[PDB]
Symmetry: C2
Subunit: 533 residues, 2 copies
Amino acid sequence: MKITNPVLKGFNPDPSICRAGEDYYMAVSTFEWFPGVQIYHSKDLIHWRLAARPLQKTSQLDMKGNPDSGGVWAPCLSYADGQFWLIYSDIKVVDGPFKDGHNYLVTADAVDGEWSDPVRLNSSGFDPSLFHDPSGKKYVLNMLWDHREKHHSFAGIALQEYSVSEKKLVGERKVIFKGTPIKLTEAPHLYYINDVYYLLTAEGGTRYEHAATIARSSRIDGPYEVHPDNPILTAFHAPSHPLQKCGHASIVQTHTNEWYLAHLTGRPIHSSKESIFQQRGWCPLGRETAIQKLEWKDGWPYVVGGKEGLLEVEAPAMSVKEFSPTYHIVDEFKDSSLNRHFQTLRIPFTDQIGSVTENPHHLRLYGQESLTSKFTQAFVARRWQSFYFEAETAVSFFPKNFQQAAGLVNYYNTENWTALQVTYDDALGRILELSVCENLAFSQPLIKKIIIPDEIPYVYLKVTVQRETYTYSYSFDQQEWEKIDVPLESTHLSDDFIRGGGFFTGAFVGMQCQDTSGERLPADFKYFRYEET
Amino acid sequence: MKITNPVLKGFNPDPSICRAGEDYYMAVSTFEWFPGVQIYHSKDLIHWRLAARPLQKTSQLDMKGNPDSGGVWAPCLSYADGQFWLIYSDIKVVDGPFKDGHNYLVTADAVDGEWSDPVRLNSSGFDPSLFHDPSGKKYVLNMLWDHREKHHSFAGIALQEYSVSEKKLVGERKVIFKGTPIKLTEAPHLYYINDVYYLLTAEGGTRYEHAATIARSSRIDGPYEVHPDNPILTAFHAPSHPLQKCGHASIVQTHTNEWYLAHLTGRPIHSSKESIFQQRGWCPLGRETAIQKLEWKDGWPYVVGGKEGLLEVEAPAMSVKEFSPTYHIVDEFKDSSLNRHFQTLRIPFTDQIGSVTENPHHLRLYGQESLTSKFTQAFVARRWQSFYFEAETAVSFFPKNFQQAAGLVNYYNTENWTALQVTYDDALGRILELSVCENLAFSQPLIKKIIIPDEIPYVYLKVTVQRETYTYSYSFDQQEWEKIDVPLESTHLSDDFIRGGGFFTGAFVGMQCQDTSGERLPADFKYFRYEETTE
């Protein structure tokens, strides 16, 4: 059987792969979505289950107010000395000359167990990584961010020893590698292989110039010599390749003595009226995770099939293990916790915003701030993970003023979303309203406003996504449906469309309630269906 | 003696004036600056002292991450039933279709006492105000914010009863007033005068179309009849008038039976190459507070001297009461509390960012995030309150890497500031570097870097503000000052220059340290001089 790429579909960037015995884990970045970090598990590298989200407490991760695509950037997950180590960031500034953000370490005995509270590491640049040197010494790597006007912002790869006993970085940091002319050198990961240190980095930025670079040295602090056919992974030169933005990689040696390379990639939708060489495409599924196979020659690794990456990769010599599903196709909210594929923006799910117990078999959302707020939104959502799917909910909501609205949302960031919501109009009563926010340009295009009769206990809401286009429809009895004939562009919910310094997540679909009057009016959602078609 | 306007200079907007006996107070907005709300006190309406900053605890005001010019918008201060009542807002969203923000009520027996924990009122629009009806009932007014595409966002003035005993609004809200064609109707305040309800509002927005309008009704919920010579306050038609943006007013009747109108105003700097009618000016001192006298005719008040406002205003018949200064020209940081004119961005001053006791007679700042961060900045600052002044400090700072810098800062918001900082360069060692951030465009224009010798214990830093321009200078000895040949424009630190949805504060000058490496390297400031030199 082959590995079929991407192995993590939808928003799952910056994969950090590691091994514990015959178990394999990958951590991916989550930015402003809470809880933070997703860890997937596999026994064959083909099939991956969502196993854990470590950062569940505000003591670990406090992101209220964080900018769009701030928060948890690339993480580093490792296993050594009988425990898992997770290095993560909380980025507070994502535009301008600075990139204010802080790097932390937590540990756990199992990925789905309780994680420690964080140790502060440094703030000097993102993509922090923990390297377990064969000696037993530990080192933290990260990129150095240089704000100064006259310097490239990616000032190279810093190395500094981490003292387990002092719970701090010690000594002085050293810049061990400045990168290649591709620049934007980041994502440092160190490997010790046959008594040689290999430094893997990403270069080119995470758009279409993305690459994975590798260098090697007999000493941990260099100097490092670059791979003769560098970069080892990129699709920069190949605009028509189905995998784009190929970079930010990590390496695993399997227990079967085989070598594999996890990396992020985008799968763009193109415009037929543009050249793909000039307009490389739009990715509503964000940056996904793919796995390539490596082969070695003369002490350098090479990506099997060429540096562009393959859609179908030769799987390692392991028994196939498919996993039980981890979400309900129709979630009826029978569980005491929200299913693990649901996340909230920035803050934990508490009765500040909602409850799964107050009205049994419903998700109740207490109306809070609008979809444009970086603070407290009663919004529970899950990733688009296919170009073709339907999502559906049913909402009991009886608003009494125009500042109350609840329903079904497709969302990229606070400036980019659409929403089909039950709201209230003083002259007409309950109405069903379409709202559109495109880089903070707001529109409500329905001239024909849809009146909802008083006797309808639930309004059924649906979105049908068909690659480049998606459309809403609604029903008052879940039998006769009415299409909202406003075709919406999926590419408007993509990394490549939205403005600003942070463009790092992906499209989500979810259930939402706002009450900007102050009443905290609740909306009860009977179910949430997500069905890929 | 007359009232000389502005009575509160520099950033002091949205004045809410009230009387307690023969004491007069004004609350002004503070936006992202902490602690929140400033209350001033006067015995004669001529002289005002900074008396209190009520919102001191994160339990009352938690602004970490707030956008620039979010946070504490216009407040409402009132005195009734033996206590002070303060209505304030925490605005989370300042651009786009929404204006997410929440309104709260706190109380105190004295304005500089301990204020209560907040009661939640509503979230339906900013400028909340508490009216004490002669029936003994209480009402909250606020503007209603309408996000809907096809409606003007200022949908009128809401009114709803507040229950003291239940600690919540009760009944249902009513829209009691929709405004005039000036629109952007906000700042509602109710007054009950000669058995008539008078509703005062601001219209036209807080730029150069700002106005105060007033309307009256025999019933609290209207309909209200508009003043026949409305608006009663505005400089919209008079671009050359020295007071501009005149609006967001509040009324007080003195214990001497006289009537006054406090209002915000801007004092713009103009460009000689533009028409003042097209480019109405730039205000680095932000929105300031002025007071006018009112006179009545046929049940309507009129501003004495015309709708535009006067610089010198007839004072009430009260004994003059001057106050002595509430800051030292040269603050040597001998006190263990920061002087009341210093504020921090968004968060309280704690060991997270500094200490005035760790190194006695110095302000120590532990290097945290850059000047562009909306979270944790080790930055202690005070308002520009004069067009002409000098500010000066002396810093002990020994950075070891380029991500550590500390010094003297002039600042409007996270995207707009300049900084003269001791930093480290791997090729030169300690250097003194000038950084400039203009609507997030960043430059360091000194071609030749200024090297600091190792043996210098303190670097002396000065800014000389000269109305439309300001310049930095420095000294290693405190006796010989070296020029920094970069002219900077004061108008770039103004409400009228900066981009974005919130433009509501004013220029500050302060002491700052950043360490974006993680070491929290300390900088020690020996003193802070702020010396105004107007006249």
